[PDB]
């Protein structure tokens, strides 16, 4: 009821044994009443590592998108080693979403690595179960066995109706996903552990399908973008391997489903100044001259009768002399061109002082030999060239034309394919102009270039006019155990890709949310634009180039920091060599670096002085020692992970305050949220995701099931908790309900339609479904629905949530009125009460933990010791936690060696892995998540609690209690002890 206190553990240890004499009764009672639950005490185990690989094929759908819906690919298995290193080999194949699917090596939620199907963003199959939301559901297939060698899996995806189907060895899989969120792009993915060998088959050039695709399903290889070539790559990574060594890599840039749609500017309604009959005709004539010259250069000629094989121009007259349609074609050509120019900031004109007469119009080498020759060339480029802004303007004109073209192509119903197929309405060039290759970019620009030069010669006066913030930065720092408070130290940073990198010395208490140098916690240098940041910005030094090494030295004797670029010391504007001076030592300094989107770098601390470059040039004889030189093992580094998680609200938070009021008359214990700086300057308003620190767990079996009636109170199972919205706070900006442990969405524009949801349906052989289970991670109701029923109303809004742990359903009421919204869940599920609110008043919300007639309070559900106590109470363990976007994580010392290489045009792309890699995981029972045990090196409270837990284990096992030792052997096994014996970190 109070929390994790080591003093209680010490009390139990003193209970066990005193003065060298063991009390067997106390030891047995403690072992019986503490160990079997496997809750409230941290757990330890050994797990394997899981890595995922994708084929770099992104497919999705949107309104007016240029992509295709149905897709299908093949995966074959060559070698599988069952039970490698005491654990079953992991191998799953499926689809993953671009946004939200960012697995990391180690840690994770659910007693091990996630892989495919352990989150609501990925869907997978492993030969016996369907995996989604970290939940496995058995499925019936003619061949029911785990993924074996020489087994082939066919994976298809339909976007018109959300449904992912699998087919093993031709035999269909009776289970299918449905009704999943369509935001983002889907890509194939395979997750695996050490000891596997698989091969992707996308058809066409790369691989051959073992079984024919279902009708209407296109091969995956047809979805490759023209700008890129096929290549196997991991999903996401914060490091890579190179000849220099481990290259730290920043966040990557990914496309979106809305990027493929064309969004041009309509110009048909645009009116034009009186320039049509004045200069539009002249522009048309110039276009005719250039186009006829192009024909004359080739074998095309002008015969009286139009013919293609005979090379005969239809008009066959020097002057175009076209009839109404043919002439109006070029008339509308130039009209649309002028309309596009006027739609943008460019303003057309003809102020040239009769420069048309001054034009040459005589470049006739007599190469023409027929009627439609003598096409004058104005030599407009020779007179005046095109400015860079003019060339850019040509570029956006071509882009606008291509975009409107793609718009009609989508309107008729065309789609994109890597292979051209006219009967199939598939065109490999209808992607947006940015996504087009340079060949078609040049092909759709020459005529516009000529027209724009004509405009220049004619005197045209046209003149050209939160959540993502965390995802665009990545910080790597040395571990807090390597802080230096004396001496002179040096390290190096190589910038492989120039731009958006910031290297320097930070402090142990540096936060991951804030940028480097924004706060006083870091002294950093930015070489992309050549400045130094301690608190603010100030120019210093020169920008770097690709392959440049910057050496950072710090001396705490002189309290200075010096940055050198390629062996030369950078100096400020005044000429001072030291970038910073008069720096208090404080608690020490650590090496730190920050990388932006699509950036790579090499952080060389200098374990081996031979590999350290430019050290002898500057630093060796100046008395500086390389950082981390004499240590035997490489430095463990911690990186800034952008996975949102719920953390307790700090008591010193400047903006939000939590009050704990209880025991009042006619009011149950409650927790009230208040805004400290509302209605004042320097106040920030944003979405706030709050939850309770303790969950309520449903029963294993769903076997049905004035003053309060005691018999019903003892026989009831329902529970109640309410949320009060104070007057002045808009009910339209509150969502009240429950959240599963796996909720990691920090959307600033949260809506009830943005929640995850997926229905898994099991069918029979004939296709008659018999089970359809819905899975999500957020069960809430919106206050907008209640207020709409009916300015600021003095009456508060009370929303009460009722749950039934036996039946398995939850209902919602507002102001004592039953609401139509209800939810149903599955057994063995734990939900935390939660509210998502946008503050708009000084008083925001109040969690009330009370009770109703014949309904029991949440305290009994949360705490076992008070299961039969109807009196509401708020023990100190119950607390309000808020979502936090960014956190710190520990980089693993070793990583899997995944080898990817195309086997052949008929074999596909082969992926293999054989080197085992295991880790020790510490699991929190209530939160249902685990982290690496080495992460306790910085978590000094969990470390102390676990040490006292081990002491308690020794105490209960002390003095020849062999039965208790046998019982303990199940909790801590031989393998864990042997692994921990040789654990050097």
């Amino acid at each position: 009821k109070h929390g994790r206190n080591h003093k209680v553990l010490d009390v139990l240890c003193s209970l066990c044994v005193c003065n060298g004499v063991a009390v067997r009764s106390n030891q047995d009672l403690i072992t019986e009443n503490l160990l079997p639950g496997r809750e409230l005490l941290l757990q330890t185990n050994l797990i394997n590592y899981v890595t995922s690989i994708r084929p770099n094929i992104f497919v999705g759908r949107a309104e007016g998108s240029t992509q295709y819906g149905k897709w299908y690919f093949e995966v074959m298995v060559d070698e599988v080693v069952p039970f490698l290193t005491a654990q079953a080999t992991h191998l799953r194949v499926g689809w993953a979403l671009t946004e939200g699917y960012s697995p990391y090596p180690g840690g994770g939620e659910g007693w091990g690595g996630n892989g495919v199907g352990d989150d609501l963003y990925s869907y997978g199959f492993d030969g016996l179960h369907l995996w989604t939301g970290h939940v496995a559901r058995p499925v019936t297939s003619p061949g029911q066995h785990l993924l074996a060698p020489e087994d082939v899996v066919s994976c298809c995806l339909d976007l018109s109706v959300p449904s992912i189907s699998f087919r093993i060895n031709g035999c269909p899989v009776q289970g299918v996903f449905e009704a999943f969120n369509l935001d983002g792009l889907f890509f194939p993915v395979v997750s695996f552990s050490a000891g596997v060998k698989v091969r992707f088959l996308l058809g066409g050039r790369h691989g051959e399908f073992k079984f024919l695709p279902p009708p209407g399903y296109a091969p995956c290889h047809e979805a490759v973008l023209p700008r890129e070539r096929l290549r196997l790559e991991p999903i996401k990574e914060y490091r890579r391997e190179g000849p220099r060594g481990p290259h730290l890599v920043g966040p990557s840039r990914c496309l979106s489903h809305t990027d493929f749609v064309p969004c041009p500017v309509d110009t048909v309604q645009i009116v034009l100044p009186p320039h049509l009959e004045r200069i539009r005709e002249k522009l048309a004539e110039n276009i005719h001259e250039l186009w006829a010259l192009t024909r004359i250069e080739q074998g095309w000629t002008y015969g009286p009768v139009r013919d293609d094989n005979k090379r005969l121009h239809p008009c066959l007259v020097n002057f175009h002399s076209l009839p109404e349609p043919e002439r109006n074609y070029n008339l509308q050509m130039s009209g649309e061109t002028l309309k596009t120019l006027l739609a943008l900031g460019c303003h057309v004109g003809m102020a040239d002082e009769k420069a048309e007469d001054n034009l040459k119009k005589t470049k006739l080498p007599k190469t023409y030999m027929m009627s439609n020759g003598y096409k004058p060339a104005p030599l407009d480029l020779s007179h005046v060239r095109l400015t860079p802004a003019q060339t850019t303007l040509v570029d956006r004109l071509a882009e606008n034309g291509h975009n409107v073209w793609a718009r009609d192509r989508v309107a008729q119903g065309w789609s994109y394919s890597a292979v051209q197929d006219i009967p199939a309405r598939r065109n490999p060039r209808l992607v947006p102009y940015r996504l087009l290759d340079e060949a078609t970019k040049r092909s759709n620009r020459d005529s516009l270039c000529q027209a724009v030069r004509t405009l220049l010669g004619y005197g045209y006066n046209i003149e050209p006019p939160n959540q993502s913030r965390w995802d665009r930065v990545r910080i790597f720092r040395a571990e807090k155990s390597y802080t230096v408070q004396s001496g002179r130290w040096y390290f190096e940073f190589e910038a492989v890709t120039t731009g958006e990198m910031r290297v320097g010395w930070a402090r142990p208490e540096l936060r991951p949310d804030v940028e480097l140098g924004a706060d006083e916690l870091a002294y950093v240098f930015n070489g992309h634009r050549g400045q130094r940041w301690h608190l603010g910005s100030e120019p210093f030094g020169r920008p770097w180039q690709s392959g440049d090494v910057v050496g950072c030295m710090i001396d705490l004797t002189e309290n200075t920091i010096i940055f050198t670029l390629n062996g030369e010391v950078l100096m400020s504007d005044s000429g001072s060599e030291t970038a910073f001076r008069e720096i208090e030592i404080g608690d020490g300094f650590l090496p730190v670096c920050s990388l932006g989107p699509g950036q790579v770098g090499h952080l060389n601390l200098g374990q081996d002085v031979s590999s350290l470059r430019f050290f002898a040039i500057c630093g060796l004889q100046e008395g500086f020692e390389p950082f981390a030189i004499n240590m035997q093992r490489p430095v463990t580094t911690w990186f800034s992970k952008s996975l949102p998680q719920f953390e307790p609200v700090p008591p010193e938070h400047p903006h939000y305050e939590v009050a704990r009021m209880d025991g009042t008359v006619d009011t149950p214990p409650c927790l009230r949220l208040a805004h400290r700086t509302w209605g004042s300057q320097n106040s920030l308003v944003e979405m706030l995701f709050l939850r309770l620190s303790l969950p309520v767990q449903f029963h294993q079996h769903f076997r049905c099931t004035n003053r309060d009636d005691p018999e019903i109170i003892l026989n009831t199972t329902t529970y109640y908790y309410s949320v009060r919205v104070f007057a002045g706070q808009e009910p339209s900006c509150v969502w009240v309900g429950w959240v599963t442990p796996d909720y990691h969405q920090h959307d600033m524009n949260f809506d009830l339609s943005k929640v995850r949801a997926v229905t898994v349906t099991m069918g029979d052989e004939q296709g008659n479904v018999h089970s359809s289970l819905k899975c999500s991670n957020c069960y809430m109701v919106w206050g907008g629905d209640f207020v709409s029923p009916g300015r600021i109303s003095h009456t508060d809004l009370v929303i009460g949530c009722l749950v039934d742990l036996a039946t398995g359903l939850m209902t919602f009421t507002a102001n004592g009125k039953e609401s139509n919204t209800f939810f149903q869940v599955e057994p063995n599920t734990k939900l935390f009460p939660a509210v998502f609110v946008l503050p708009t008043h000084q008083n925001v919300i109040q969690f009330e933990l009370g009770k109703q007639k014949n309904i029991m309070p949440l305290s009994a559900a949360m705490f076992l010791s008070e299961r039969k106590n109807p009196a509401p109470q708020c023990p100190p363990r119950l607390e309000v936690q808020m979502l936090m976007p960014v956190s710190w994580s520990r980089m693993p010392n070793h990583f899997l060696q995944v080898e990817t290489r195309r086997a052949g045009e008929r074999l596909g792309w082969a992926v293999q892995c054989q080197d085992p890699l295991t880790m020790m995981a510490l699991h929190i029972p209530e939160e249902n998540r685990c982290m690496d045990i080495l992460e306790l090196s910085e978590r000094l409270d969990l470390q102390r609690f676990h040490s006292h837990t081990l002491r308690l284990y020794r105490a209960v096992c002390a003095l020849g209690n062999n039965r208790v030792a046998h019982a303990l052997c199940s909790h801590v096994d031989q393998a864990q002890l042997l692994h921990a014996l040789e654990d050097a970190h």
Epitope: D308, P314, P323, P325, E326, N330, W405, N444, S447
Partner: nanobody, 126 residues
Framework: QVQLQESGGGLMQAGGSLRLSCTAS????????MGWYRQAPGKQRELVAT???????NYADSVKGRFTISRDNAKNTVYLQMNSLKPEDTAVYYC?????????????????????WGQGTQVTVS
């Protein structure tokens, strides 16, 4: 959107007369060059005589026989007549409208690929 509904060209013996009606329903702008294509079963797609606004007709190899193609811009109606027949003439005919006039286009690929196909109909010769 410009939709070209093409109906006619029923099964007839050699020498029979076939009438095909093509109607292009859509925006009146860029209505021109209501050309014709034909794809033989499992063979290449050839170009039938293309008629454009202004009474301009362009012939090719596939126009062999008695081909009379006439178009009306008032209602965007093309009345193709094939008085003779040959066994090789069996193909799926399509009526296609393209903004490109008389097969000439000084604009470039963006307007060359600006094309509006049609459903078409199957013409069979015994």
């Amino acid at each position: 959107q410009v939709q070209l509904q093409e109906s006619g060209g029923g099964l007839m013996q050699a020498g029979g007369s076939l009438r095909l009606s093509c109607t292009a329903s859509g925006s009146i702008f860029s209505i021109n060059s209501m050309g014709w294509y034909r794809q033989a079963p499992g063979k290449q797609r050839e170009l039938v005589a293309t008629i454009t606004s202004g009474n301009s007709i362009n012939y090719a190899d596939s126009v062999k026989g008695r081909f009379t193609i006439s178009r009306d811009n008032a209602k965007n109606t093309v009345y193709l007549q094939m008085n003779s027949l040959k066994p090789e003439d069996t193909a799926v005919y399509y009526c296609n409208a393209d903004r490109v006039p008389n097969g000439y286009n000084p604009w470039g690929t963006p307007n060359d690929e600006y094309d509006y196909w049609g459903q078409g109909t199957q013409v069979t010769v015994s």
